[PDB]
Amino acid sequence: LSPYLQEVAKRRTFAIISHPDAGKTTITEKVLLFGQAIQTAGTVKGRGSNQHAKSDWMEMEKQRGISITTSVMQFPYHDCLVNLLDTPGHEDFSEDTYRTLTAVDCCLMVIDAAKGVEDRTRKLMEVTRLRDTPILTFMNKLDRDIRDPMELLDEVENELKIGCAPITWPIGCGKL
RNA sequence: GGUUUAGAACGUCGUGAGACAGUUCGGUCCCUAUCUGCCGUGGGCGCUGGAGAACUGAGGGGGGCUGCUCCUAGUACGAGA
Ligand SMILES: Nc1nc2c(ncn2[C@@H]2O[C@H](COP(=O)(O)OP(=O)(O)NP(=O)(O)O)[C@@H](O)[C@H]2O)c(=O)[nH]1
Numbered sequence: 001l002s003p004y005l006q007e008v009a010k011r012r013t014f015a016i017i018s019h020p021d022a023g024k025t026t027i028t029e030k031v032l033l034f035g036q037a038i039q040t041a042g043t044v045k046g047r048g049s050n051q052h053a054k055s056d057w058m059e060m061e062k063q064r065g066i067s068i069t070t071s072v073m074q075f076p077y078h079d080c081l082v083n084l085l086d087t088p089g090h091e092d093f094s095e096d097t098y099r100t101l102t103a104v105d106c107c108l109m110v111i112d113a114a115k116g117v118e119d120r121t122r123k124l125m126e127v128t129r130l131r132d133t134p135i136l137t138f139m140n141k142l143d144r145d146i147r148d149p150m151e152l153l154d155e156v157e158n159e160l161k162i163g164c165a166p167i168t169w170p171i172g173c174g175k176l
Numbered sequence: 177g178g179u180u181u182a183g184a185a186c187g188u189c190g191u192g193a194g195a196c197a198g199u200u201c202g203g204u205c206c207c208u209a210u211c212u213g214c215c216g217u218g219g220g221c222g223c224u225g226g227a228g229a230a231c232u233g234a235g236g237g238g239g240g241c242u243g244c245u246c247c248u249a250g251u252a253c254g255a256g257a
């Protein structure tokens with residue numbers, strides 16, 4: 001427990017991957033307020049939640065349309081020091097994302113519970129198994145009317161060839 | 177202020193006086209309301225002995241517009257926007 005091997009062990013550096021518009025960038029902004037980096041928060045395109053607070057999608061064109069290239073982040077949560085990446089969704093667009101995976105020891109996949117598993121979701125798992133990299137799964141968008149979370153588990157096991165272990169479970173979806 | 181008076185000029189027409197549904201500058205707009213109506217306000221009598229109060233409510237009138245924001249929710253919808 002020397003001041004060296006202690007700093008090392010308390011660190012944790014990970015990805016965040018998605019099919020385009022799943023919510024990487026949003027869950028990221030929220031992860032940032034659980035780290036006391038953003039005292040308020042925002043949305044995307046600076047949209048529906050007002051205030052010139054978008055944000056932390058670096059660049060510029062990102063804020064005009066929707067997301068471009070990996071923003072990177074370091075903040076403290078609980079007993080750890082997290083290093084957070086923000087991987088772009090789009091076939092032609094990255095690249096980069098792939099090279100970014102080279103910097104992560106593990107990885108979190110966001111899934112649109114209203115959409116299930118999409119195309120670049122499937123392609124991203126292939127790239128993942130290249131390094132036997134671990135995957136956390138987050139089922140985003142429970143504010144929306146979604147599919148049966150049972151069926152959502154099938155699509156994840158069947159099409160992504162990986163076991164599902166529910167930690168939490170939604171009670172009602174959409175307006176409920 | 178416009179434009180159908182009287183002054184004056186331009187262009188135009190006519191020998192001319194004058195003329196143009198061409199133009200230009202100037203140029204007196206009265207009424208103390210009797211009736212109807214309408215807004216208000218009293219007087220009289222009626223209502224069945226006379227009086228002071230408080231009512232019922234037939235009916236009449238006034239009022240009746242709308243923006244933006246927030247919650248639902250950036251949810252339904254949408255590939256997105
Ligand atoms: N209803 C709802 N909408 C969400 C949720 N999370 C994200 N969104 C919406 O989904 C859209 C996609 O946002 P974004 O975070 O850019 O997704 P992304 O995965 O970063 N984009 P990309 O995959 O292109 O990099 C946003 O407009 C945001 O409003 C959620 O939990 N619920």
Ligand SMILES: [Mg+2]
Pocket residue numbers: 021024025066067068087088089
């Ligand atoms: Mg993004």
